[PDB]
Amino acid sequence: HGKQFTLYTHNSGPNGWKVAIVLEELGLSYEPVFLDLMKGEHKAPEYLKINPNGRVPALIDHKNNNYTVWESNAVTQYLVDKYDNDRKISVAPGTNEYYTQLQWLYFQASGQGPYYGQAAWFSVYHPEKIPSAIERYRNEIKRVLGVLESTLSKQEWLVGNKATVADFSFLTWNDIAANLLLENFRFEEEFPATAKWNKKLLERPAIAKVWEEKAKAA
């Protein structure tokens, strides 16, 4: 055949692994292309032709005339809508539930990722240490966890009464938050429903497999 997809990514980043989880859960074949962000490969003309935003990940579907799509959650939606026909990890397009799923994916993409990412930036990469900025995004991480907790303490999954890509989407950034960004953090005590949700998801065979890969990387 040749592998169906090419996934432009890098050794270890939260959004690439997120897409990898979707691919593995769907049993889809893919070849990862690891861009060296340190060397600016993602800002080179060759990659800009794939994603003009110059960020990873991006996906090419070789079975669909090399249809190319970027933004990890748009990539995710493309994958489940077209290739999760048995609805193993997604709700059906054309239903009200689909937009609740979409709502949660937008909360992840606009409410979790960018804000956690600023915590990561100010703690690690910003040229000067700014305690008030570090504080600001640490507080936002806890707020976001509280939003998850308020729903997960009331129902088992975010949508569809089954684990979906909506639930999956929060995993990689929450891992970074718990294991790097937050200090003296006790996930299970502070956000019990969310911690338990997180634990179960990581126990899914496909997710656990990728999580082991992630550990082996970076």
What are the residues binding a second copy (CB under 8 A)? 48, 52-54, 64, 67, 69-71, 73-75, 77-78, 81, 93-94, 96, 99-100, 102-103, 105-107, 109-111, 113-115, 118, 121, 126-128, 130, 132-133, 136, 147, 150-151
Q: What pairing do the DSSP bridges indicate for beta strands 5-9 and 58-61?
A: antiparallel
Q: Which does 94 bind (CB under 5 to 8 A by kind): a second copy, ligand GDS, Na ion, none?
A: a second copy
Minimal CA–CA distance to 31: which of 45, 40, 47, 20? 20
Cα 8 from Cα 50, distance rounded (Å): 9
Residue number, 75 or 182, with CB nearest to Na ion: 75
Q: Name the minimum Å distance from CB 134 to ligand GDS.
A: 14
Contacts of 46 (CB under 8 A, 6+ apart): none
Binding mask 138-167 for ligand GDS (x = CB under 6 A): ------------------------------
Tell me the DSSP string of 142-153. HHHHHHHHHHHT
Q: Name the minimum Å distance from CB 66 to Na ion.
A: 21
Residue number, 126 or 162, with CB nearest to ligand GDS: 126
For residue 134, which phi and psi values (nearest 5 degrees)?
-60, -40
Binding footprint of Na ion on the chain (CB under 5 A):
13, 15-16, 56
Q: Name the minimum Å distance from CB 24 to a second copy.
A: 20
Instruction: For residue 151, count CB atoms less than 10 angstroms from its CB and return exposed for 0-12, middle for 13-18, buried for 19 or more.
Output: middle
How does DSSP classify residue 38?
T
Provide the token pair at 73.
Answer: 């959650």
What sign results for the dihedral spanned by CA atoms 143, 16, 158, 212? Answer: negative
Place of tokens 């409410």: 111
Binding mask 92-131 for ligand GDS (x = CB under 6 A): -----------------xxx-xx--x--xx----------
> What part of residues 60-99 is at the interface with ligand GDS (CB under 6 A)?
71-72
Cα 137 from Cα 123, distance rounded (Å): 10
Q: Name the minimum Å distance from CB 216 to a second copy.
A: 28
Helices (H) and strands (E) in the chain, counts: 11, 4
Number of residues that bind ligand GDS (CB under 6 A): 18
134 binds ligand GDS (CB under 6 A): no
Binding residues for ligand GDS (CB under 6 A): 13-15, 37, 42, 55-57, 71-72, 109-111, 113-114, 117, 120-121
